[PDB]
Every structure is written in structure tokens, then in C-alpha cells.
Symmetry: D3
Subunit: 138 residues, 6 copies
């Protein structure tokens, strides 16, 4: 039997957003979201850690080739999200509140489509150094 | 079914302490604890990461409102622990050795009383950048 | 029943290496490993986090004594790995590709021999701030 | 703290149903469900194991008073399900195919409604001695 | 490495007991325990499944030699428990209510005493075919 | 998303074998295997529970079409194993001791070959009503 390990790669992207549910009154929104509801928005340098799991290849010594993982992350996170306004430049958030929880879910779905079956293990998103969301496909 | 995610918030506090079990001889104490047994104490800037888990709300997009989580952490960690001497200013450590393991347990119990049933998932305490304790209620 | 917690200690070491499987052609190697295949090698300041788990002792307040853990890590990581060339100075990598996955496995085995039965929980190795491998004995 | 254990109670109920999807043509239903699509139905003596988890109470030695668990199951399982025709007698299955999987889900939901938050651990349904479904709220 | 599997052995024993707490008045005991509080006791043919886990030995193909497992269970279960009156014949239950939960705990403890560190995985006790308790050392 | 559940199907097969290691002397084999080493063999009516896990399909209400699961098991279990002498009739056991543990492993492997990636969850093999092995791919 081959050994199994978890391989993680961290990436960063800068983006803008405003927390606001159109399904709530301007009064409720301001109450639920407060400062994050700033009409003109605000932004963050997000840090994303993507974890893959599998067998360590017996000849190559890798769970997955870093170049492949890099490329998957470029297409699934960097391309659609870097230097964008989440609520305005990405179709997905047209109906979904751009909380870090939903950013983590979005990234998970993107990667699921690109990655081999069962490779994805966890997506961790730091909206700030103190605000972190971990999504494991639950 | 709603999706479930883990929401973490990091906080910091400075405190003082001395590791010493009155249930041991001054000779044993010095042997078990060594430098941490310094009679006049020493101190640390502790970093605490508190993780909550639950469903991502369908309208709000949050596992829990950050303001509520912030407030819970203020009452359960900051208030009793920040700028205090653990063994002298907090009743709990009058009988318990103030190791990081017990600091993690203390914080867990405090939060359990304040948080909704089943929300708390993990308490991580960095006594130093190199010394970490994770308590999951086990 | 005693409470159980996870105790982690982080250590660092600098080492050199080159990724190259003798079981592949010079052409394949360069293709699989690319830059990491540099004939004269390259190097990293590796960060290793070792996690132990067990009961918090009722009198001492510790899952494990830090001095013992420190010493185990000195013998199992620092001694054989610090300021060494992985592929040339450590027997283990004479047949194994020195990927971070195999470095994590090596460290795990070393520690398993030194530690009490069932204490070891996880070995996390940062080859870089962005490249991390977690091995849990799977 | 207090030790935690799992308490299971087995219950059995008699019911009939017909596997049929209104989104599939008469021909697809036969092909997908075969004999289970028999127009007039068929039936089973379903066996259901409900597992609860919690701390063993220090004075009574119980995770849950069996009398309470029995009442819970009379309500969540026996009353709506026993000696009924699933597809016609229980509104839930009006728009849901009555597979063993959906019976398990239905039961899980009825139980979460009555039981203390966090108590329910698993629902196991034996449609026959050979076909079993386990639902754990995933 | 070597594959890991779980080995279970089922054993059965006959015993009597009475559910009664000396911390509850005669009236509370009746109310809490009902028929199980019958002054002269009642009994069960208890069925116990003991699960061990470990690596499949490469030469013998065994996780544990069944002969060793049988002896372990004769000692931990059959000798102290078979054909006994729980509350009167086993000192452990002198101060502990003999619920199925406590029988499982007792058995788990007796086994941890004899078995190799880390081997014991689960203890399942059927008091009746309908009342089951699973203890996993939590 | 879609709910996830586990589907199990039980199958039974008749077979004979002899526990014997060619790496052990005639005397060690008797000592290690006892009665199971009987030169002419012995046999069992093996019972096998195969557990699959996945999402409950939104239209059919199935985790897997039972017809597909039956065919899978006819192929992976019944055909190579039923009414056979394990050590002599199945090449796999030519060099592997036919313990229940190895039967479980063998079955797990045959199933992983046929089943969709990620579907197989557990293999449980009852050699007798008292000796059970569970393999989960570890
Ligand atoms: Zn924001
Ligand atoms: Zn200190
Ligand atoms: Zn490198
Ligand atoms: Zn049916
Ligand atoms: Zn009883
Ligand atoms: Zn046999």
C-alpha cells in the first residue's frame, strides 16, 4: 500500500466587495452587515490555502505535481477573482452575498470541476489575518 | 440542505503567570517546570483562535455574525484574561496549573457557556509562536 | 476521565537538495521536476510542526513535558537534517526522492521510533511559506 | 468530564409502497425500478435502529431515559409510518420517491424535530435483511 | 506500510441486576427506572462485541491471534461477569448504577488493562436485542 | 447540495480454506493456527456486507441502483469465491494466508476495480457469527 498525505498550496488575490442582500431592507442590511455594507464597498487581500490529498507516488514522491496544482489554482481562483470586484465582475455573486463563507464555497466548486475525483480536501480562506473560513465540502 | 463551514476569529491578550503545582515540592516543581517556575513569574502575548461551525445562512451568507462572535470572545477571553496575572487574578487558576493546556480548557468552558449548543468546534492557543495547544472538548 | 488535547512544537532547519529520480531519464526528470532538478541543487529553510496528543496530566497540567518533546525533536529532526544536503548526507534519501512529502514521512518514522505509543498525531512541513505537506501516518 | 456513549433502540414497522418517479415515463420507471415499480405496490417489515449520543449521566447512568427515547420513536416513526402505505398515507412521500434512503432521511428529520439539539447520531433502516441505509445528517 | 483492519469477536454472558440509585429516594427510583427497579432484580443474556484494530500481520495475516483475543475476553468479561448478579457480585457496581452504559464502560476499562496500547477500538453491548450501547473510550 | 447516505447490500458465499503459512515450519503453523491448520481444510458460510456511500439522487432517490450493486457483487465476490476452496481455487491466496482479514482485503480490491471512484466505503466479512473483520481501505 502507498502512503497518503495532504499537499497544500497558498495563493493570494486582491478584490473588492460590499456585503448586501437585496432580499433585505436597506435598514436591515446596515444592521446585519454594518460597515461591510458601505455603498461604495471596501476590499481585502485574500489568502487562500487549497489542500489536496492522495497517495505519495512511489517514483515521483509527489501527491500531485506542483505545476498542475499551480495551474488549477490559476484557473479556479486567480483568473476569475484577482483584482476584481466580487459582486460586480463575477456572475456567481450576482445572487449570492460575497461573504468569506461564500467565497470559500465558490472556490471549492470551481476546483471540484477541475480536479480529479476525490483529490480536494479543504479550502481555507483568510479574509483578513483574523478572519478565516474553512470549507470541506459539507 | 444548507452548506456547513467553519468560521474562525483570532484574538490576542497579554498575561503573566508562573507554572507551579502546590501539590509538589519546591524541588520537584523546579525540576518539572524549570524556568517557567520563576517565583516572580514571566509572561506571554497569547494568540487565541476560536472556531465555530454551522450552516451558512441562505440569506445572510454567514455561519455566525462576526459581531456576535466578537462579543462572545470579549466576554469569554479578553475580559477575564487580558492584562492579568493568570494565577493571581483569575479564580479558575487558583487550583489549576496555568499551562497553555489549561488556558485552552478554561477558554473552551467559558465559550461553551456563552455559545449556542454545538457551535464551538475548536480552541487553539499559541503561548508563543512555537508553542501551540489545540483543545476540541475531548 | 482526564481531558485530552493536542500539543504542538515548531522547529526549523536549513537544508539542501535536488529532486531527481534515478529511475527516470535525464529528460523525464527535467520534465517532472523542472527547476528543482538543478544539478547543483538548491535549498530551503524548512519549518516543521510536530503534534502530540494525549491526556492533560491532572497535577502537572501538561500533555507532555516540553523538554522531552524538545529533545525528541532534536534527535529526530535537527540532528540528522539541519545544515545537511538531504540526498547526500542522510542515508534515507539515497533511494527516496527528497520531496517535502518524503521529508514529512521520514520525520514521522523517526519520531515514531522515539515517542511513546500513540502520542504522535501529525507532522506538518513547510518547504516554503506557500508549500505545505501534512502527514498523519496514513 | 463525563464519559460519552451511544445509545441505540431498535423499532420495527410494517408498510407498503411503490417505487415510482413522476418525472420518468412509464417505460423509464419500469427500467429503473423493475419489480419495485409493480403498480399495486409491495411491502416490507422495516427495521429501524435509532442511535443517540451524549454523556452518561453521573447519577442515573443513562445517556437518555429509555422511556423518553421510546416516546420519541413512537412519535417520529410508529405513528406516521406503521401499517401505512408510504406513497399515499404520508404527505412527505407525495413528491418524494419512497426509497429506503428517503425513508431514512424522513425519519432523521422527524427525529431532529423532537430530540435535544446534538443528541441524534445515526438512523439505520433495514428495508429487508439485505438492503440497509444509514443516514447521519450528511 | 501494512494495511490496517478491525477484528471483532462476539461473546455472550448471563447476568442479573437491578437499576437503583442510592442518591434517589425510593419514589424517584421507581419513577426514573420503572420496572428495572424491581426490588428482587431481573436479568439478561448480554451479548458483547469487542473490536480491535491494528495492522494485518504480513506473515500470519492476522490483526491479532484469535486465541489471544479469546483469553483476553475470558478474563475481562466472562470471569467477572458470567452468571453473576451485577450489583452484588462485582465491586465496581457497588457504587455505580448497572446500566448497559456502565457495563460497556466497565468492560472497556477491564480490556484496556489487558490489551496492547492502542489496540482496543470499540465495545458494543446488547442488553436485549433492542437496547444497545457502544463505548469508544470517549 | 444533495444529501449523502450509505447503502449496504449483504451477500453470502460458501467456501473452504486452510490457514497455513509456508514461511512457518509445520510445528509453528500448528502452534499459530491450531485447528484452522487442519491439513484437509475446513469451511464457512461467509456473510459479506458491502457499504457504498454517495449522494441520494434527486430524481430516483437512490445512492446507487441496487441492480448495479448486485452485478458488482456477483462479479467481485460470488464468481471468484462461491463454492470454491480459497487457497487452491483463487490465485490471490496462492501466496496470501486466507484469514478473514485477507478475504476482506481481497474483496475490497476486487470492488475498487469495478466501482466508481470514491463509492466504496466499507467491506464487512463474517467468517462465523462470532469472527468479523471490517476493512475500510486503511
Ligand atoms: Zn469584507
Ligand atoms: Zn509560560
Ligand atoms: Zn525544493
Ligand atoms: Zn421496496
Ligand atoms: Zn435491565
Ligand atoms: Zn476458518
Amino acid at each position: 500500500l502507498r502512503r497518503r498525505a495532504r499537499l497544500s498550496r497558498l495563493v493570494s488575490f486582491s478584490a473588492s466587495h460590499r456585503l448586501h442582500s437585496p432580499s433585505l431592507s436597506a435598514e436591515e442590511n446596515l444592521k446585519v452587515f454594518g460597515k461591510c455594507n458601505n455603498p461604495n464597498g471596501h476590499g481585502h487581500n485574500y489568502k487562500v490555502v487549497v489542500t489536496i490529498h492522495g497517495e505519495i507516488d512511489p517514483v515521483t514522491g509527489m501527491v500531485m505535481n506542483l505545476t498542475d496544482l499551480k495551474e488549477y489554482m490559476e484557473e479556479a481562483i486567480m483568473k476569475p477573482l484577482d483584482h476584481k470586484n466580487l459582486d460586480l465582475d463575477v456572475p456567481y455573486f450576482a445572487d449570492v452575498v460575497s461573504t468569506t463563507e461564500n467565497v470559500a464555497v465558490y472556490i471549492w466548486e470551481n476546483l471540484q470541476r477541475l480536479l480529479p475525483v476525490g483529490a480536494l480536501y479543504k479550502v481555507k480562506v483568510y479574509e483578513t489575518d483574523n478572519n478565516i473560513v474553512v470549507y470541506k465540502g459539507e
